Design an enzyme around this catalytic site. Structure first.
Site, PDB file in Angstrom:
ATOM      1  N   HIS A 243      19.668 -53.385  40.725  1.00  0.00           N
ATOM      2  CA  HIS A 243      19.710 -52.240  39.824  1.00  0.00           C
ATOM      3  C   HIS A 243      21.024 -52.139  39.048  1.00  0.00           C
ATOM      4  O   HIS A 243      21.143 -51.259  38.188  1.00  0.00           O
ATOM      5  CB  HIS A 243      19.429 -50.932  40.579  1.00  0.00           C
ATOM      6  CG  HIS A 243      20.428 -50.586  41.648  1.00  0.00           C
ATOM      7  ND1 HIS A 243      21.793 -50.639  41.455  1.00  0.00           N
ATOM      8  CD2 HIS A 243      20.248 -50.129  42.912  1.00  0.00           C
ATOM      9  CE1 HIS A 243      22.409 -50.264  42.564  1.00  0.00           C
ATOM     10  NE2 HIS A 243      21.493 -49.943  43.463  1.00  0.00           N
TER      11      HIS A 243
ATOM     12  N   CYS B 190      27.182 -48.970  46.326  1.00  0.00           N
ATOM     13  CA  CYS B 190      26.095 -49.936  46.353  1.00  0.00           C
ATOM     14  C   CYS B 190      26.647 -51.350  46.413  1.00  0.00           C
ATOM     15  O   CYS B 190      27.670 -51.659  45.803  1.00  0.00           O
ATOM     16  CB  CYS B 190      25.217 -49.777  45.113  1.00  0.00           C
ATOM     17  SG  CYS B 190      24.315 -48.220  45.067  1.00  0.00           S
TER      18      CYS B 190
ATOM     19  N   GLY C 253      29.190 -45.566  43.742  1.00  0.00           N
ATOM     20  CA  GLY C 253      29.964 -46.783  43.647  1.00  0.00           C
ATOM     21  C   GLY C 253      29.929 -47.643  44.889  1.00  0.00           C
ATOM     22  O   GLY C 253      30.506 -48.735  44.880  1.00  0.00           O
TER      23      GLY C 253
HETATM   24  C1  LIG Z   1      22.388 -40.443  44.733  1.00  0.00           C
HETATM   25  N1  LIG Z   1      21.101 -40.992  44.369  1.00  0.00           N
HETATM   26  C2  LIG Z   1      20.814 -42.375  44.688  1.00  0.00           C
HETATM   27  O1  LIG Z   1      21.612 -43.045  45.250  1.00  0.00           O
HETATM   28  C3  LIG Z   1      19.475 -43.013  44.361  1.00  0.00           C
HETATM   29  C4  LIG Z   1      18.362 -42.252  44.602  1.00  0.00           C
HETATM   30  C5  LIG Z   1      17.125 -42.787  44.340  1.00  0.00           C
HETATM   31 BR1  LIG Z   1      15.584 -41.702  44.663  1.00  0.00          BR
HETATM   32  C6  LIG Z   1      16.957 -44.062  43.872  1.00  0.00           C
HETATM   33  C7  LIG Z   1      18.071 -44.824  43.645  1.00  0.00           C
HETATM   34  N2  LIG Z   1      17.856 -46.157  43.164  1.00  0.00           N
HETATM   35  O2  LIG Z   1      16.768 -46.466  42.854  1.00  0.00           O
HETATM   36  O3  LIG Z   1      18.921 -47.070  43.147  1.00  0.00           O
HETATM   37  C8  LIG Z   1      19.341 -44.322  43.886  1.00  0.00           C
HETATM   38  N3  LIG Z   1      20.523 -45.137  43.610  1.00  0.00           N
HETATM   39  C9  LIG Z   1      21.315 -44.672  42.449  1.00  0.00           C
HETATM   40  C10 LIG Z   1      20.592 -45.106  41.168  1.00  0.00           C
HETATM   41  C11 LIG Z   1      21.273 -46.239  40.402  1.00  0.00           C
HETATM   42  C12 LIG Z   1      22.011 -47.252  41.276  1.00  0.00           C
HETATM   43  C13 LIG Z   1      22.917 -46.676  42.363  1.00  0.00           C
HETATM   44  C14 LIG Z   1      22.766 -45.168  42.515  1.00  0.00           C
HETATM   45  N4  LIG Z   1      23.266 -44.702  43.798  1.00  0.00           N
HETATM   46  C15 LIG Z   1      24.673 -44.628  44.102  1.00  0.00           C
HETATM   47  O4  LIG Z   1      25.530 -44.984  43.346  1.00  0.00           O
HETATM   48  C16 LIG Z   1      24.988 -44.055  45.473  1.00  0.00           C
HETATM   49  C17 LIG Z   1      24.824 -44.782  46.643  1.00  0.00           C
HETATM   50  N5  LIG Z   1      25.089 -44.256  47.845  1.00  0.00           N
HETATM   51  C18 LIG Z   1      25.508 -42.997  47.942  1.00  0.00           C
HETATM   52  C19 LIG Z   1      25.682 -42.177  46.788  1.00  0.00           C
HETATM   53  C20 LIG Z   1      26.126 -40.822  46.907  1.00  0.00           C
HETATM   54  C21 LIG Z   1      26.282 -40.048  45.761  1.00  0.00           C
HETATM   55  C22 LIG Z   1      26.019 -40.591  44.494  1.00  0.00           C
HETATM   56  C23 LIG Z   1      25.574 -41.905  44.370  1.00  0.00           C
HETATM   57  C24 LIG Z   1      25.415 -42.698  45.551  1.00  0.00           C
END
Ligand SMILES: CNC(=O)c1cc(Br)cc([N+](=O)[O-])c1N[C@@H]1CCCC[C@@H]1NC(=O)c1cncc2ccccc12
Ligand SMILES: CNC(=O)c1cc(Br)cc([N+](=O)[O-])c1N[C@@H]1CCCC[C@@H]1NC(=O)c1cncc2ccccc12
EC number: 3.4.19.12
Lengths: 301, 306
Positions: free
Chosen positions: B41, B145, B143
């Site tokens: 992603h 991921c 950030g």
């Molecule tokens: C929060 N929301 C979701 O994380 C999310 C929710 C769904 Br439903 C689906 C996806 N998806 O499909 O990738 C998600 N990943 C986001 C989408 C694009 C790529 C990475 C994104 N996530 C992060 O940066 C992230 C990771 N860990 C803890 C976090 C805590 C707070 C903020 C962000 C994160």
């Protein structure tokens, strides 16, 4: 979101772990630049430990009497000295993996990461707090002396603890990297009861702020207290008195949540008096006191 | 003595963490030999995330759309491909700090260490369990991921988790290093729900053995229970059924303590029904289920790693 007991990445410290052997006594050492640091009781036999004269024991040893091994490879000692309770062995070469580092003496209630080692090899990494009675509730076995505690700031490792002993109650005692013990303990096999411990009030407050940030707010109430009225409750439940400097250190968390510190103290007073009634806070049924305000900031934005 | 939530030494994994930037998105990648692995992603804009077709979105990218940095050194991407939900970027240079590694898919209830990273920089390390509902109760921010979970056997790093997302309930979901999600989750911004969780019984028993090893014996009793009678109580309090395989892996802890597994099960049965009566076990007022039998042995015998 989420809140975990999180240690610093241990790689920068792993590259410094060596084995130090004097006679049949072997423990862990910390190799930084051209010096190896380890507990001075490596120069003691078991019978020496009952009543050691470290200055005499050191002259009866020599540079050649110290066997330093870095990853099954031997290092050669070119100098020996004693600073308080740490032995310092000057070696042939500066450690090429020496990180940016400082030696610090932490205050009680501050946390740090421990790299538990055996024979200079790491077993695991975990977070500890310097308890108000200057012990730490670590996880150490025979052979762990010389393991160190540390924090890492933007690429600089602050070493703050070196492990020396386990007390009869199962907690641990040690020195800073200048060899001064935390607390009144001494590197001798003698009765040394740790004093009664207390709960780290500012850390418990920091952790409740972490709970509010993560969505746990059932314990907030509409009441407030003064610093003096709160401290009367603290002494009743064996909590450290709260000071104005502690209030100020919680300032960042109070600002992010909008909950004034003395308001959170009112919440803490109710929790101490009424318990939790079968609820949990951040997955815990007890009030957690080994997270500093800076630990909370790091995880909770 | 003492018993702590203990993570593996993270140094070997720290040497593999890089930064991956595609457009305005930057996350973490895992650089092993000449390949960088990261969540696919990263090629998506926020609008793409609502209903992405990764095959189309990847055809539209090129090597130059990917910016990989290992510390202050830029790496140049010479190939890009997709394996399930992980992006694979071939780079010109092999990582000289590549450890011995394998990619493994862990089972629910198994544990591993997470090296939380941000912008390619390791920030912290902690132990977590693959929950029976295939989530992990982690600590992650925006950030994070591409952060990975792993186990170490002597000098071999077994990578088992790559972080992809935080569900709205606050738990975390990700893939193995072949890009297959744990659980029914998908890398799409859409309504998704984790199933109901259960308590990992064999881990609670392991942790009780750790408590006995550390001198906590108040919860021991003279009784033994059968597997079936225990499982009748276990299922009623949302505990996983105990299996014969679970008994066998508890064998070393049973032998070291002299307490038969079904003897310990009698203690666990009473603890589940009656609680602790204002006592604690290893400092906890609750039963802990994120230590495996192998975690206990590793910590209480001093297993070490390269
Ligand atoms: C929060 N929301 C979701 O994380 C999310 C929710 C769904 Br439903 C689906 C996806 N998806 O499909 O990738 C998600 N990943 C986001 C989408 C694009 C790529 C990475 C994104 N996530 C992060 O940066 C992230 C990771 N860990 C803890 C976090 C805590 C707070 C903020 C962000 C994160
Ligand atoms: C157990 N006893 C003491 O630890 C002890 C107690 C006192 Br009072 C004073 C000293 N002293 O003065 O050095 C002690 N250290 C011992 C003396 C010689 C050198 C190191 C010795 N300890 C360890 O190896 C050790 C460290 N950590 C956790 C352990 C868990 C189980 C067994 C051993 C340890």
């Amino acid at each position: 979101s989420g809140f975990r007991k999180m240690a610093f990445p241990s790689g920068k410290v792993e590259g410094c772990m060596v084995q130090v052997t004097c006679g049949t006594t072997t423990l862990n050492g910390l190799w930084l630049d051209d010096v190896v640091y380890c507990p001075r009781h490596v120069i003691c036999t078991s019978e020496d430990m009952l009543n050691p004269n470290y200055e005499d024991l050191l002259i009866r040893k020599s540079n050649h009497n110290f066997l330093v091994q870095a990853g099954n490879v031997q290092l050669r000692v070119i100098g020996h000295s004693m600073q308080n309770c740490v032995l310092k062995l000057k070696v042939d070469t500066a450690n090429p993996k020496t990180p940016k580092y400082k030696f610090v003496r932490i205050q009680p209630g501050q946390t740090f990461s421990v790299l538990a080692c055996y024979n200079g090899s790491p077993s695991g990494v975990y977070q500890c707090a310097m308890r108000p009675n200057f012990t730490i509730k670590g996880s150490f076995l025979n052979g762990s002396c010389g393991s160190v505690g540390f924090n890492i700031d933007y690429d600089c490792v602050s070493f703050c603890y070196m492990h020396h002993m386990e007390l009869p109650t199962g907690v641990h005692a040690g020195t800073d990297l200048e060899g001064n013990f935390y607390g009144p303990f001494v590197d001798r096999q003698t009765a040394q009861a740790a004093g009664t411990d207390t709960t780290i009030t500012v850390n418990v407050l920091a952790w409740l702020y972490a709970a509010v940030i993560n969505g746990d707010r059932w314990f907030l109430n509409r009441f407030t207290t003064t610093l003096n009225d709160f401290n009367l409750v603290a002494m009743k439940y064996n909590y450290e008195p709260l000071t104005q400097d502690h209030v100020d250190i919680l300032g960042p968390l109070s600002a992010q949540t909008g909950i004034a510190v003395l308001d959170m103290c009112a919440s803490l007073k109710e929790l101490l008096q009424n318990g939790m009634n079968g609820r949990t806070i951040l997955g815990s049924a007890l009030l957690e006191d080994e997270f500093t305000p800076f630990d909370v900031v790091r995880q909770c934005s």
